[PDB]
Swiss-Prot record, chain B:
Species of origin: Arabidopsis thaliana (Mouse-ear cress)
Domain of life: Eukaryota
Gene: ndhK
Chief place of localization: plastid
Cysteine pairings via disulfide bonds: none
Protein name: NAD(P)H-quinone oxidoreductase subunit K, chloroplastic
UniProt membrane topology term: Peripheral membrane protein
From Swiss-Prot, chain C:
Name of the gene: ndhJ
Enzyme kind, highest EC tier: translocase
GO cellular component, one term: chloroplast thylakoid membrane
Keyword Acetylation attributed: no
Protein name: NAD(P)H-quinone oxidoreductase subunit J, chloroplastic
PROSITE patterns membership: COMPLEX1_30K
Subunit structure: NDH is composed of at least 16 different subunits, 5 of which are encoded in the nucleus.
Biological processes, Gene Ontology terms: cellular response to sulfate starvation; photosynthesis, light reaction
UniProt-listed Enzyme Commission number(s): 7.1.1.-
Known catalytic reactions: a plastoquinone + NADH + (n+1) H(+)(in) = a plastoquinol + NAD(+) + n H(+)(out); a plastoquinone + NADPH + (n+1) H(+)(in) = a plastoquinol + NADP(+) + n H(+)(out)
Primary location: plastid
Source organism: Arabidopsis thaliana (Mouse-ear cress)
Family assignment from sequence similarity: Belongs to the complex I 30 kDa subunit family.
Swiss-Prot record, chain D:
The name this protein goes by in its record: NAD(P)H-quinone oxidoreductase subunit I, chloroplastic
Membrane topology annotation: Peripheral membrane protein
Cofactor descriptive note: Binds 2 [4Fe-4S] clusters per subunit.
Family listed: Belongs to the complex I 23 kDa subunit family.
EC identifiers of the protein: 7.1.1.-
Domain 4Fe-4S ferredoxin-type: 46-75, 86-115
Binding annotation for [4Fe-4S] cluster 1: C55, C58, C61, C105
PANTHER family: NAD(P)H-QUINONE OXIDOREDUCTASE SUBUNIT I, CHLOROPLASTIC (PTHR47275:SF1)
Curated annotation (Swiss-Prot), chain F:
Residues included from the entire protein: 87 to 199 of 217
Gene Ontology MF: a single term: oxidoreductase activity, acting on NAD(P)H, quinone or similar compound as acceptor
Phylogenetic lineage: Eukaryota, Viridiplantae, Streptophyta, Embryophyta, Tracheophyta
UniProtKB keywords: Chloroplast, Membrane, NAD, NADP, Plastid, Plastoquinone, Quinone, Thylakoid, Transit peptide, Translocase, Transport
Membrane topology according to the record: Peripheral membrane protein
Biological process, per Gene Ontology: NADH dehydrogenase complex (plastoquinone) assembly
Function field: NDH shuttles electrons from NAD(P)H:plastoquinone, via FMN and iron-sulfur (Fe-S) centers, to quinones in the photosynthetic chain and possibly in a chloroplast respiratory chain. The immediate electron acceptor for the enzyme in this species is believed to be plastoquinone. Couples the redox reaction to proton translocation, and thus conserves the redox energy in a proton gradient.
Quaternary structure and partners: Part of the chloroplast NDH complex, composed of a mixture of chloroplast and nucleus encoded subunits. Component of the NDH subcomplex A, at least composed of ndhH, ndhI, ndhJ, ndhK, ndhL, ndhM, ndhN and ndhO.
Protein name in the entry: NAD(P)H-quinone oxidoreductase subunit M, chloroplastic
Family assignment from sequence similarity: Belongs to the NDH complex subunit M family.
Length: 356, 167, 155, 160, 146, 110, 75, 77
């Protein structure tokens, strides 16, 4: 039972974490996940900062998809103050949020395919960041979410590049879909892990790909009527193969479902930039409001107890992947050191929203 | 208020020795090869631009360093002790970043932890910013003539036992 | 609420605080009866617990570790949300953990003990999940001062 | 016939290695783009352009900031409403370039540029002045090593 | 290919203000700075990419102004000058001059570059080692345009 | 694991069997390694003064379970003592390393 | 509408704030025991925070703290 | 005990200075002018060529004269 140190510079690059295991032989049997490495104290500083000052702070959580964090932390005060967003800016927010979900799943499967290369996905990613530069102007550090919608307007080149992104992107996606059917090393090196079912993934804490992996059509934005999700084409992954390749088909189907949503929303266009802007500064109320949105990892959440002041009295975040991290102590029992790379890939986690 | 160096002379003042010093310094300024050290928001530049933690002396700290990260970080600098230095490439390796006031478990820069040559603007710039940073580091090492191989150990220690109370 | 006058009305303290902002409901529950109350709300239709919220109103006074338990499932979509309000104080941090039955509450109760210091039982490994194990004091409570540490200043 | 099943597994493996080798051989034909060193639009939010005489009053840069970094000393001059502003000190090590007061300025003298080459040798050098923040950075068309960056188009294949 | 021609040292001891026209092709710039350092001199660094009012920064004890993060006050203190304290940063007597290595030719008004060439001749222990807007070769023309 | 220290610039706890510089194995002998990076002057009499001050601080600040939090506290106020000693001019800088970043700020004209 | 004004020095005794954690680090020590914290906001309770130490603030009872004087300290 | 050649000088030294002088600038020039205009078959054979033709490039590695003017500019330095 030689204790692994599981150091800060991992052989993989998926964050800094600590997974000391007794590992009798090569079989790992007992996990003790030590965290607190990428920690910044978001709750107390968010109690010490306003919404327009913790609004630059929402970038250090799920920075592979930064639209979700600022999206939920601006959708908090919109439903809190009951201020209506017009349909145009809300649908463009839906388009860019699904594009960030696309970016999150491809930036998962990039380094996951690198561990188990970079320019096989970067030939898409250069046009993806060109879309981010034509949408807000930054690469992943955007500050463009207001109460009335997008802080700016879409330029006349971004809608043309958004029309071109579908037949720029879906063809290389379906050229990348047939690899797991062709290449048997993904049928023999990541096949098998992920043995949890649906009645158990509901039982512990799970959401997102680990909950859809069992053949459950789960969606917050389908159950909760949000952003007119029943107008668009939906196909939530009812893939019941359980394992890690079931999760890969889950993520391919989620990317293709977002492609279908954006492709139906290419020519929608139902309406200004910011509705209800009389003054630059405002405040918040005091309610008992827990707002949640469909994360790419499953139910990102914002807890809020107001102060009727410039600062929020309570600001607690429920990150999706940190609740997802609870299952590895149970998904460690009968695997190997060559398996934990596939495990910490298939969790689909970065340490930005973990410690926070 | 500073100290005083020795500054006696330059003993290696032949043409062959200064030629070899210039060529070794320019080749030292040519072969960066970092250990990557991503695992944060500055990992995203690696896909656009080893594993032995004693090998690559020319590492740049492209990560958000915290107080719990600090013992492994100073141990890793002990694993890169003499030849080369580190490059701060996240405002949190410089000033603590965006949480420079109120964060308890985040160090206000690694400028109180490790010698740093170059300070970046911080939050993920364009992928040619790291190229300009390693070019400016190459200009820095080109100024260095390997200090004419001039060496001092302090070795401060007490052999009196502390008033310990373990678990 | 629904279950406060139908299931917890048969000899349990489901002390309601009214309705919440959208559809949730806050019901005050004492730590004394909290594990059996958790099992009773578990065998009701409610299975999915997420976002244990440890809010620190009245610093030096009342301390709470509320829940957001609902009844989502695979085929049905009857999302009935409720806040199980458990309460404590600074002098009494003793609270029962649900980690004996709901064994996914490791990280949640460890963060609650890590940021407030709420003393727990029936828990397999209660450790400081974000801070070092030598660390004293708790930052999330509003009566806390970060001591004279040079890494907290720029200088 | 278990070794026959091993052979059939390796036949499917060799078919997959050949097909993926064709895929990667086609992936190696990404010749026109090749992003590298030189040897965007207006919202780059890089180096922030500042104007001194258009900067007058209401100190919102110090208020809407997530860290409250700006340090501007001011003494009121009588009967003319002039604050006598001096030493617009911005530390870019403190600064995030997150851009609140760039668009939230009542004067709107705070504008962004495309400069990001501020990698410096010392942290005390980063404390910049008001005249250093009024510099036009670069006209990137006018370099002998920088061509036209593919802003509007993509995969042009015109350099060769 | 390696000049090994100390004519740049003759330029820095004759004119003491030369635009170092040299690319971003690695560190082919500090070798003459290394030859000035091996001559007994001391060379320190500056950059004009964020240096404003350069004569008011090299002299006249420009203010410190510590950046408080919404907690401390202004504390308008006077930091020591750039090159006056650098002349005060020569503890032995064998140091013949002080080289001011400047590495930013862009965003530097030609008027202010001529003003900075003034303190290269204001004393006799000031060497200006400014950049030359990144030519392809290694050229050292003098401060003629500035 | 085996390393139990709070190691920063000019303050390194290093509770190990380190009589000279060769590290080892681990015991209650806290070997205070000072100035790894050659940042200041650090004359030997002033180093003896700072080491005696640190000895008095660890003598008066012990009695409680010696864990990592006491190590943070003692390295932190040791760095405060070094900062207030260099601000009064007992510790000058170095200008012999390849950085000389002036980590405690430039001394003013006051 | 409140107890005291905003900007007075806060002196803290170890017995006067015995509800908090002021007796764990017996001896290291602390710094906000003397006239160092300043009142920044008030509600029964008052916000506090040092004039030079940039750390997070805190909320403390109006009798648990004490308005000491108007003497800031820096450098 | 053969000595089939019996040549004293200017047999392989001529071929050596030919391969080390005439070849490497044309090889490096073909590496420059065909950097993008290539099939992966062409890049494949160029990689094989530059692998075969390495140690002649030692006198042409530090020197670089005709390689940066993608305009019609003037030497305004
Ligand atoms: S400064 Fe910001 S972006 Fe850079 S490493 Fe630190 S937290 Fe990440
Ligand atoms: S620049 Fe903005 S913050 Fe500064 S004085 Fe003018 S309006 Fe106020
Ligand atoms: S640039 Fe960004 S970080 Fe700096 S003051 Fe403006 S909004 Fe704040």
């Amino acid at each position: 039972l030689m204790i692994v140190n599981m150091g800060p510079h991992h052989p993989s690059m998926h964050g800094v974490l600590r997974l000391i295991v007794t590992l009798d032989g090569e079989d790992v049997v007992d996990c003790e996940p030590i965290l607190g490495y990428l920690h910044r104290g978001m709750e107390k500083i968010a109690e010490n900062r306003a919404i327009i000052q913790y609004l630059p702070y929402v970038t250090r959580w799920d920075y592979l998809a930064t639209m979700f964090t600022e999206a939920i932390t601006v959708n908090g005060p919109e439903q809190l103050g009951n201020i209506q967003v017009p349909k145009r800016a809300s649908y463009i927010r839906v388009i860019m949020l699904e594009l960030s979900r696309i970016a999150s799943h491809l930036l998962w499967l990039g380094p996951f395919m690198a561990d188990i290369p970079f320019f096989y996905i970067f030939r898409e990613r250069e046009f993806v960041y060109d879309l981010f530069e034509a949408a807000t102007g930054m690469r992943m550090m955007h500050n463009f979410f207001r109460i009335g919608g997008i802080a700016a307007d879409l330029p006349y080149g971004w809608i043309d590049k958004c029309l071109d992104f579908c037949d720029y992107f879906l063809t290389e996606v379906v050229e990348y879909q047939k690899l797991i059917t062709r290449n048997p090393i993904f049928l023999e090196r990541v096949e098998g892990v992920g043995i949890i079912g649906g009645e158990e993934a509901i039982n512990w804490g799970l959401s997102g790909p680990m909950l859809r992996a069992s053949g459950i059509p789960w969606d917050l934005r389908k159950i909760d009527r949000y952003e007119s999700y029943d107008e668009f084409e939906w196909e939530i992954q009812w893939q019941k193969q359980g394992d890690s390749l079931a999760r890969y088909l889950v993520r391919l189907s989620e990317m293709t479902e977002s492609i279908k949503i954006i492709q139906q929303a290419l020519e929608g266009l139902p309406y200004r930039f910011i509705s209800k802007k009389p003054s630059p500064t405002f405040e918040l109320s005091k309610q008992e409001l827990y707002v949640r949105v469909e994360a790419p990892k499953g139910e990102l959440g914002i807890f809020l107890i107001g102060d009727q002041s410039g600062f929020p009295w309570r600001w607690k975040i429920r990150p999706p992947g940190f609740i997802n991290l609870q299952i590895l102590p149970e998904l460690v029992k009968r695997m190997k050191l060559a398996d934990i790379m596939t495990i910490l890939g298939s969790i689909d986690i970065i340490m930005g929203e973990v410690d926070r | 208020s500073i100290k005083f160096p020795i500054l006696d002379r330059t003993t290696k003042n032949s043409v062959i020795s200064t030629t070899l010093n210039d060529l070794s310094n320019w080749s030292r300024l040519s072969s960066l090869w970092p250990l990557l050290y991503g695992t944060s928001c500055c990992f995203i530049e690696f896909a656009s631009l080893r594993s032995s933690p004693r090998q690559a002396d020319l590492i740049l700290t492209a990560g958000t360093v915290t107080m719990k990260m600090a013992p492994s970080l100073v141990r890793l600098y002990e694993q890169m002790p003499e030849p080369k230095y580190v490059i701060a490439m996240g405002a949190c390796t410089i000033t603590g970043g965006m949480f420079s006031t109120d964060s308890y478990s985040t160090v206000r820069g690694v400028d109180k932890l490790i010698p740093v040559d170059v300070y970046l603007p911080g939050c993920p710039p364009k992928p040619e910013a790291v190229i300009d940073a390693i070019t400016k580091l190459r200009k820095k090492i080109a100024r260095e003539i390997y200090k004419d191989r001039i060496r001092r150990c302090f070795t401060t220690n007490h052999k009196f036992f502390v008033v310990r109370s373990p678990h | 609420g629904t279950l406060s006058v139908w299931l917890a009305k048969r000899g349990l303290v489901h002390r309601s605080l009214g309705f919440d902002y959208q559809g949730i409901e806050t019901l005050q529950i004492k730590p004394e009866d909290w594990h059996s109350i958790a099992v009773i709300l578990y065998v009701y239709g409610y299975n999915y617990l997420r976002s244990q919220c440890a809010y620190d109103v009245a610093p030096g006074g009342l301390l709470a570790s509320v829940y957001h338990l609902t009844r989502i499932e695979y085929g049905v979509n009857q999302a009935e949300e409720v806040c199980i309000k458990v309460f404590t104080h600074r002098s009494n941090p003793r609270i029962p953990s649900v980690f004996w039955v709901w064994k996914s509450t490791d990280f949640q109760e460890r963060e609650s003990y890590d940021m407030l210091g709420i003393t727990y039982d029936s828990h397999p490994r209660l450790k400081r999940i974000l801070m070092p194990e030598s660390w004293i004091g708790w930052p999330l409570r509003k009566d806390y001062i970060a001591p004279n540490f040079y890494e907290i200043q720029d200088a | 016939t278990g070794f026959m099943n091993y052979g059939q597994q390796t036949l499917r493996a060799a078919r997959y290695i050949g097909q993926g080798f064709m895929i990667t051989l086609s992936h190696t034909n990404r010749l026109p783009v090749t992003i590298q060193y030189p040897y965007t639009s207006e919202r780059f939010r890089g180096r922030i352009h500042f104007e001194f005489d258009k900067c007058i009053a209401c100190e919102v840069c110090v208020r809407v900031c997530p860290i409250d970094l700006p340090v501007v000393d001011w003494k009121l001059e009588t009967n003319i409403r002039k604050k006598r502003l001096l030493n617009y000190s911005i530390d870019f090590g403190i600064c995030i370039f997150c851009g609140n007061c760039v668009e939230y300025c009542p004067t709107n003298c705070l504008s962004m540029t495309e400069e990001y080459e501020f990698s410096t040798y010392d942290r005390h050098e980063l404390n910049y002045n008001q005249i250093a923040l009024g510099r036009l950075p670069m006209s990137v068309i006018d370099d002998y090593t920088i061509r036209t960056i593919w802003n509007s188009p993509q995969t042009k294949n015109g350099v060769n | 290919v390696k000049p090994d021609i100390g004519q740049w040292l003759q330029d820095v001891e004759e004119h003491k203000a030369i635009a170092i026209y040299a690319p971003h092709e690695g560190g082919y710039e500090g070798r003459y700075l290394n030859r000035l350092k091996m001559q007994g001199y001391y060379f320190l660094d500056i950059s004009a990419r964020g240096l404003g009012d350069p004569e008011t920064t090299l002299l006249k004890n420009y203010p410190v102004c510590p950046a408080h993060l919404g907690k401390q006050p202004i504390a308008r203190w006077y930091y020591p000058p750039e090159v006056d304290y650098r002349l005060a940063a020569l503890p032995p007597s064998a140091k013949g001059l002080v080289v001011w290595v400047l590495e930013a030719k862009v965003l530097s008004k030609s008027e202010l570059q001529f003003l900075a060439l003034l303190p290269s001749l204001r004393p006799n222990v000031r060497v200006i080692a400014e950049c030359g807007n990144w030519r392809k070769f290694v050229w050292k023309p003098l401060a003629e345009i500035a | 694991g085996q390393w139990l220290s709070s190691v920063t610039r000019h303050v390194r706890i290093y509770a190990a069997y380190i009589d000279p510089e060769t590290c080892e194995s681990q015991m209650d002998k806290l070997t205070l390694i000072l100035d790894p990076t050659e940042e200041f002057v650090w004359d030997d009499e002033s180093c003896n003064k700072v080491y005696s001050y640190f000895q008095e601080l660890v003598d008066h600040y012990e009695g409680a379970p010696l864990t990592e939090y006491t190590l943070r506290l003692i390295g932190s106020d040791v760095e405060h003592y070094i900062r207030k000693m260099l601000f009064d001019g007992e510790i000058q800088y170095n200008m012999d390393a390849r950085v000389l970043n002036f980590s405690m700020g430039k001394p003013r004209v006051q | 509408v409140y107890s005291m004004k905003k900007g007075q020095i806060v002196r803290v005794e170890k017995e006067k704030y015995l509800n908090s954690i002021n007796y764990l680090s017996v001896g290291g020590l602390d710094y906000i025991y003397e006239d160092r914290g300043e009142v920044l906001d008030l509600r029964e309770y008052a916000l506090v925070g040092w004039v030079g130490i940039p750390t997070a603030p805190a909320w403390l009872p109006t009798d648990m703290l004490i308005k000491c004087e108007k003497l800031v300290y820096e450098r | 005990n053969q000595q089939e050649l019996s040549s004293v000088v200017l047999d392989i030294g001529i071929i050596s200075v030919w391969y080390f002088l005439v070849m490497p600038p044309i090889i490096m020039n073909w590496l420059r002018v065909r950097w993008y205009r290539r099939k992966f078959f062409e890049m494949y054979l160029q990689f094989m060529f530059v692998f075969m033709f390495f140690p002649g490039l030692l006198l042409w590695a530090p020197f670089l004269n005709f390689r940066k003017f993608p305009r019609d500019p003037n030497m305004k330095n």
